[PDB]
Point group: C3
Chain length 328, copies 3
């Protein structure tokens, strides 16, 4: 019922024929793609241009029922046509994409005795991006030097990793500093109830029984893997406690990379709560077919619409799969 609207350039664009919006905890800035395909059966499409182009670069919002889904910029304007077809589409990312694409211009080239939050405030400001803090960022860093051509995202992400926190964004394209949430979606995904379809992949191709980390050592065991499968790794950033932490990070990364579960539901809104499905919320999962019975963390959502209807694809992970400690 609620309509989905793209606003760009003081203009309003509704009636799209295909919409895909990603929100994600693992890919800074997510994505939107909107397409409108008209067919002209009089074979006179080329005499029947309808909208003025959406300029690439334009500030952009997508709303459902007046509620914000994504805030960013048009990356790509993508027109095409033939004798009986006009297709226009735009693609882009939320505001934080500037943090991913662009260089840090902080002329003194180093931060002194600053927390992650103070640094993020600095590098984000000339992009007009707000920094939201939802967790303890811990101690200041004594001295941080900008690497050559380092982007605001690459800097913040490396700092984040030394403080055991995560970087993401909100629906308003603000930078969010957080940790894996305790907040509940207010809903379960129950096989036979609200799950329209689902898909999984559970692998040991990248799983190992023992991670040995060497400076250039320390063993980190993964007791889930009951066959002899050793992995030795040099990591020149490494301390015996440091190598153990990097080994633990290594076990944790291989686990997340080896499990996938994606649930397709009807609607972008949770019917119980009436709230949009949201990343970094916890959702009980009861799925006998797949072999899941645990509370999971929503890591990503694909919100889509076509002729068939509105769907949301919810990618879920073990809630401590995105929880780390700190770097060297």
């Amino acid at each position: 019922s609620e309509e989905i609207v793209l606003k760009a350039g003081g203009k309003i664009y509704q009636g799209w024929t295909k919409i895909g919006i990603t929100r994600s905890l693992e890919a800074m800035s997510g994505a939107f793609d909107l397409e409108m395909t008209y067919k002209f059966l009089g074979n006179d499409a080329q005499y029947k241009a309808f909208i003025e182009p959406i300029k690439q670069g334009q500030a952009c919002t997508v709303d459902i029922g007046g509620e914000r889904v994504i805030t960013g910029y048009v990356d790509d304007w993508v027109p095409s046509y033939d004798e009986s077809t006009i297709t226009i589409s735009v693609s882009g990312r939320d505001k934080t994409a500037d943090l991913v694409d662009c260089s840090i211009d902080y002329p003194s080239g180093q931060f002194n005795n600053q927390t992650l939050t103070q640094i993020a405030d600095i590098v984000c400001k000339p992009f007009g991006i707000k920094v939201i803090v939802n967790t303890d960022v811990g101690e200041p860093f004594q001295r941080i030097q900008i690497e050559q051509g380092e982007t605001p995202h690459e800097l913040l992400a490396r700092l984040a990793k030394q403080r055991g926190v995560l970087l993401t964004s909100d629906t308003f394209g603000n930078l969010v500093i957080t940790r894996a949430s305790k907040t509940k979606a207010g809903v379960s995904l129950i096989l036979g109830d609200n799950v329209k379809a689902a898909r999984g992949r559970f692998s040991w191709r990248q799983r190992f029984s023992k991670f040995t980390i060497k400076a250039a050592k320390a063993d980190v065991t993964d007791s889930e893997i009951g066959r002899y499968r050793p992995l030795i790794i040099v990591n020149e950033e490494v301390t015996a406690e440091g190598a153990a932490k990097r080994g633990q990070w290594e076990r944790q990364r291989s686990i997340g990379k080896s499990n996938m579960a994606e649930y397709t539901v009807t609607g972008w809104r949770i019917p119980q709560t009436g709230k949009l499905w949201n990343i970094n919320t916890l959702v009980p999962v009861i799925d006998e077919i797949m072999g899941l019975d645990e509370e999971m963390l929503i890591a990503s959502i694909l919100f889509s619409e076509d002729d068939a209807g509105r769907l949301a694809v919810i990618s879920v992970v073990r809630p401590d799969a995105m929880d780390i400690p700190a770097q060297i």
Copy 2:
């Protein structure tokens, strides 16, 4: 007019599928030619209709008697099943050898030679001729051949230094040229002669400012890009503020061509007005309100295709300043 492949004293025409690509940006023209027969009877199945065309043979492709490819068959691609037999050949201009093969030049160095002189030397043993179409500029004081370097790789970096383009002609010669101002003799007009078109206009790789790097730094601004989007690049090759400005302009220019694409599909391979095949490196006026184009564009690439339905030219156009590298 037939498309004729000539190879090994033999002549082949009557292809059921054709794709011939020529490009200002490519080191060699390319072809793909296929003969298929379907719904074969019980006695017709599993029977060769042609002696295999051997890979590696010198060949030419002509369209209506006019050369479009002078090179070699790269690939012999036969296939069949219970009701079908398909044979296909693909290949490239002679200048393919400059892309595939190593420079063998015992001394490993050129001294006080121009791009042209160096090109002449490295192409020579492949029996490839160099055609010079533009100002090649100053000689290079000293050039070393890097380990395993190909003629294409060497000549490419030299052309980058001099602001010129490397391509081939229809005769398999190496052509050193620049973007021309030669007119195509026709316009691409929405509602007139365009069958289909597609485009992509992106700011993904566009920046508001290019800062290059010594003590020397220079800011080259891109006025097309109206959001704060800085890029900082260090180049240890630059030693001057004029050098840093020059590399910044080179970086800005490169980001344009990389960010825009437009492709026009028209009926037939020849321009009706002139009777000639569409040609690369010519200027074509484009009036197209759906894309958002109302200007002269440069033809960078053409695919001449044919199948069941008929013949199409797919013409890739770029803003002419995208081809002018300084």
Copy 3:
């Protein structure tokens, strides 16, 4: 002849989509087994857990011995799809690092070293050919896998590594053993496909180990010519390993034979997994006469790999054939 997966104390029958690869080119091959059940949102079997030891047989004959890599469940409103995939046991040699605290092998043959590195994986080494002289000193490269190490040794001894149906490591040579069947166009070939190219073929292979007024001259070098490429097409390759002129020529010839293999493809589709004339499964590393006027083949070819597949229509074997001379 039913095809079965034996894993986890059970024999699984009723697979509807099967793909099994045996290859001289890809250590460990692959299996993929899938079942689609048209029925709502209810598990009918228990998850087939990734990691389990497993066997695939056809008509009681062993085809692959290894582990389940992936458990790939899915479902929608009307169907449940269950999918497993894996490798052969030798996959552990491909995935994993060598854990050998000495770091070096002294005065050992290829066989002795293979005996050592396969042992903790529980993989028997089968030797079916003269492995030749011992190596004097072999150092294990940083994070070297057992297959990596043995593969670089095996090429210096003019031999090949593969696997048997029991997941043992096999050290062998291009075989003289005939398959007992010819592949003949109009006879037993359902479909075939080929690509014969000179894109990666060269006339001469040269392998090698402020301007100087007096450059240092000489150096370790060898030329190896490919008489079949009748045009000037030279390739110069700097191998930093090679310290001898004899070694560079052996590298050169290897490079020439590899180019031939890389440049030709021929794949024959036949009905069935067994050879009607012998009753045996098609086997890699056996010779097959090929007669084929469409492609232009009239030679004895070696089987380099087989894809055994099954679906709705029935069982096919895709036999990938190669010139023997460029394997020996």
